[PDB]
Amino acid sequence: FLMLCHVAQTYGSEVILSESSSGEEVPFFETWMQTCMPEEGKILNPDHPCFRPDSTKVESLVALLNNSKLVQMKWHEACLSISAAILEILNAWENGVLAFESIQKITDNIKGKVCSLAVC
Amino acid sequence: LAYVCEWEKWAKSTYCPSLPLACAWSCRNLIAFTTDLRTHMIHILDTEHPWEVHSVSSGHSEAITCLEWDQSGSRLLSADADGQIKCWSMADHLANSWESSVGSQVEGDPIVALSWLHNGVKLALHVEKSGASSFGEKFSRVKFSPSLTLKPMEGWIAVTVSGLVTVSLLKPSGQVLTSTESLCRLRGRVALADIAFTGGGNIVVAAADGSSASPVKFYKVCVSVVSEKCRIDTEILPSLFMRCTTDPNRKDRFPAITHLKFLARDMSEQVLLATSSLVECWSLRKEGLPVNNIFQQQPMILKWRILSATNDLDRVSAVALTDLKVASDTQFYPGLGLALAFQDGSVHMVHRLSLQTMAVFYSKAMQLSWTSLALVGIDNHGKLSMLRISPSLGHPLEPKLALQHLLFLLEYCMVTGYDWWDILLHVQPGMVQSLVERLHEEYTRQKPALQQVLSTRILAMKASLCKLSRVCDYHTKLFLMAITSTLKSLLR
Amino acid sequence: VADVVFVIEGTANLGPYFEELRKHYLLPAIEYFNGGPPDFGGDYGGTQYSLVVFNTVDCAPESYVQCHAPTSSAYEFVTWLDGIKFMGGGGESCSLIAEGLSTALQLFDDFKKMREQQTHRVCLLICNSPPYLLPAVESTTYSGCTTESLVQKIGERGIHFSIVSPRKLPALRLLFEKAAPPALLEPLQQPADVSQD
């Protein structure tokens, strides 16, 4: 994923085109085509890709609560880090749920073998 | 339908493809007629006796935007802004004579023309109904922060459409330079429309490219700091966008107008715009965010909400728009009415939030002339002259309510001292006879004392009512009365 | 020190007469505070004043006040406004400017925010047509009437105020002496320039 993001930063369109030219499938081309480009699409992410069913909706919440994060291989928070960002903004200064525990939770989410979290 | 002109020797200019057009005047003499003959000159024309059309050569290219401010004759001459604002004031109102009041925006292309002088008058028409309020509660004025007062001064400061930072070097009636330089966020790209008059003495602007992305360069700017200096703010207001792209079906909307109105709280004119028509509307309703779900259990923030949206069939928009928060049940006049001409022949004029249908009587850019619904024919048909349609205010008939609305708007025009063109709207002068009778009765009884400053004007108003016909008697009688009274009074 | 105010309003009513009055009353008044009108630096020097001349509602449905004269060095913009004031004003002859003098009061207000460190504030207003109207300001928060204006100009602040009208005398001087603080509207005289009107 790091190499893909670097290729995107370098050239972009050609890589996503070669990846989405033909074939009857649908991989996670959203977080790979809505990260950084000469187009904001900022509120678009809360609007369109925010289809987050209750399934694993509190998964990232329980993770940030009791990380102590690489227990089992699971990559779904990438397309669902919206709840993570919501909790972060609500605890940091918007509501003040955590003064310094927010930094601890961020460091826990900054655990090794996890780089996509930084991208999100 | 009615009131159409034509140009004999000139035509659609088949040699040049096209050119965007615009004009708008909330005061008297509301014809500007941006066009291309067969760059080109700019025209001015009055509402009465339009035979004597006038024009004057410009000194720039493409003449993109112009919009006057007050009854004082002026214009903007945008599109590299050569020959900037001035008055006419020479002998009459038929010669431009652009004076040395020029602001040198070197090789630019802004599309902004704004910064009016004072507040918008308040009209409690539905509640007051002008029974015996004597213009007290029927016509008021809400306290409004004047832009950079010192006495309310005013300049032609605008926003760089082509550029991306700001406008400076303001010299209003003082001939002083006051030159500075500001950074203005050091980055930007805009194709926006201006909305100036907000609560504080600030200006609002937001649009960049269209439906493709969702950027809005909200620039909350402050200009009044000290004499001989400028400190233009770079406050980024909360961003927003057109939620039209929520449809997974398609997203080809690409708006190109997104204009606003002088009331910066209750409109958002985003719209899907070849091969599309879908109006949208959002508000600025402040509300707190749902800070929850973080555990077992500053709220002041702004998140926009929807107002109205639907699928329609239209191409060209003209203009957006009394006050809101009124249960306008018995009211059927174009209160905050938003209409726009339809390409396919007839014009389906219908107020906001319903858009359903109105009477049609089966077998480029415009703006609303006034309360009386008589539009200007600058629709998407090429270099064609102006048109007018039925100003009928609502479906049903109500002669009492009709004359009531007529006297309301007449008294409004009187107190505001603007021009009046509700002539086409009123029926033959018999009803108008009863109207002026009731009007002078109320004037005499419940003046209570403004008569000593409001008499003369309304007498001339009387003339207009007696202008159209068999009843030409009162016309001449009132003219002689007015001229004799004036001459004797000044001789005293 | 020497905080004066210069006001004229008879432009709509009678223009040429002012030009005559300038030859005898306006121009000598300014020489009391300057060695001669030429072209000098302008700043907060105490002796500065304003120049306010407007019209009535007759043929101005979009303008009431456009005054701008903070210091003007007492020479340049003073002479300009004197010789380039206006030539308009029609309608009839019933009232030209009362709401103007109220705004004049407002001007004194800014002195309180500008002339910090008294100054024996003085003011002078000219108007040929006898004014009377119901509205008060239509421009700012303050509001009242001619009576309120005069009691503010006299009692609220000891600003010496006079009215050097044309040789004719209307029914104005009478009511303008109802102030317990001495109004001193005496300086309407063909004799030479008074020391302090």
From Swiss-Prot, chain A:
Coiled coil, from the record: none
Motif LXXLL motif 4 in this chain: 61-65
Compartments it resides in: Nucleus
Tissue spec. comment: Expressed in the adrenal gland, brain, epididymis, heart, kidney, liver, ovary, pancreas, prostate, skeletal muscle, small intestine, spleen, stomach, testis and thymus.
Family, per entry: Belongs to the Mediator complex subunit 24 family.
Assembly, per entry: Component of the Mediator complex, which is composed of MED1, MED4, MED6, MED7, MED8, MED9, MED10, MED11, MED12, MED13, MED13L, MED14, MED15, MED16, MED17, MED18, MED19, MED20, MED21, MED22, MED23, MED24, MED25, MED26, MED27, MED29, MED30, MED31, CCNC, CDK8 and CDC2L6/CDK11. The MED12, MED13, CCNC and CDK8 subunits form a distinct module termed the CDK8 module. Mediator containing the CDK8 module is less active than Mediator lacking this module in supporting transcriptional activation.
Function text: Component of the Mediator complex, a coactivator involved in the regulated transcription of nearly all RNA polymerase II-dependent genes. Mediator functions as a bridge to convey information from gene-specific regulatory proteins to the basal RNA polymerase II transcription machinery. Mediator is recruited to promoters by direct interactions with regulatory proteins and serves as a scaffold for the assembly of a functional preinitiation complex with RNA polymerase II and the general transcription factors. Required for basal and activator-dependent transcription.
Protein name as catalogued: Mediator of RNA polymerase II transcription subunit 24
Organism from which the protein derives: Mus musculus
Residues of the full protein shown: 495 to 617 of 987
Curated annotation (Swiss-Prot), chain B:
S-S bonds: none
GO biological process assignments: positive regulation of DNA-templated transcription; positive regulation of transcription elongation by RNA polymerase II; positive regulation of transcription initiation by RNA polymerase II; RNA polymerase II preinitiation complex assembly; transcription by RNA polymerase II
Keywords: Activator, Nucleus, Repeat, Transcription, Transcription regulation, WD repeat
Major location category of this protein: nucleus
One term under GO cellular component: nucleus
Sequence ranges of the WD repeats: 59-98, 187-229, 252-292
UniProt keyword annotation of 4Fe-4S present: no
Compartments (UniProt record): Nucleus
Signal sequence bounds: none
An MF annotation (GO) of this entry: transcription coactivator activity
Family per similarity comment: Belongs to the Mediator complex subunit 16 family.
Quaternary state and interactors: Component of the Mediator complex, which is composed of MED1, MED4, MED6, MED7, MED8, MED9, MED10, MED11, MED12, MED13, MED13L, MED14, MED15, MED16, MED17, MED18, MED19, MED20, MED21, MED22, MED23, MED24, MED25, MED26, MED27, MED29, MED30, MED31, CCNC, CDK8 and CDC2L6/CDK11. The MED12, MED13, CCNC and CDK8 subunits form a distinct module termed the CDK8 module. Mediator containing the CDK8 module is less active than Mediator lacking this module in supporting transcriptional activation.
Entry function: Component of the Mediator complex, a coactivator involved in the regulated transcription of nearly all RNA polymerase II-dependent genes. Mediator functions as a bridge to convey information from gene-specific regulatory proteins to the basal RNA polymerase II transcription machinery. Mediator is recruited to promoters by direct interactions with regulatory proteins and serves as a scaffold for the assembly of a functional preinitiation complex with RNA polymerase II and the general transcription factors.
Name the UniProt record assigns to this protein: Mediator of RNA polymerase II transcription subunit 16
UniProtKB/Swiss-Prot annotation, chain C:
Native organism: Mus musculus (Mouse)
Similarity comment: family membership: Belongs to the Mediator complex subunit 25 family.
The organism's place on the tree of life at top rank: Eukaryota
Stated name of the protein: Mediator of RNA polymerase II transcription subunit 25
Subcellular location: Nucleus
Assembly behavior: Component of the Mediator complex, which is composed of MED1, MED4, MED6, MED7, MED8, MED9, MED10, MED11, MED12, MED13, MED13L, MED14, MED15, MED16, MED17, MED18, MED19, MED20, MED21, MED22, MED23, MED24, MED25, MED26, MED27, MED29, MED30, MED31, CCNC, CDK8 and CDC2L6/CDK11. The MED12, MED13, CCNC and CDK8 subunits form a distinct module termed the CDK8 module. Mediator containing the CDK8 module is less active than Mediator lacking this module in supporting transcriptional activation.
Gene assigned in the entry: Med25
Annotated stretches, region: Interaction with the Mediator complex: 1-197
Role, per record: Component of the Mediator complex, a coactivator involved in the regulated transcription of nearly all RNA polymerase II-dependent genes. Mediator functions as a bridge to convey information from gene-specific regulatory proteins to the basal RNA polymerase II transcription machinery. Mediator is recruited to promoters by direct interactions with regulatory proteins and serves as a scaffold for the assembly of a functional preinitiation complex with RNA polymerase II and the general transcription factors. Required for RARA/RXRA-mediated transcription.
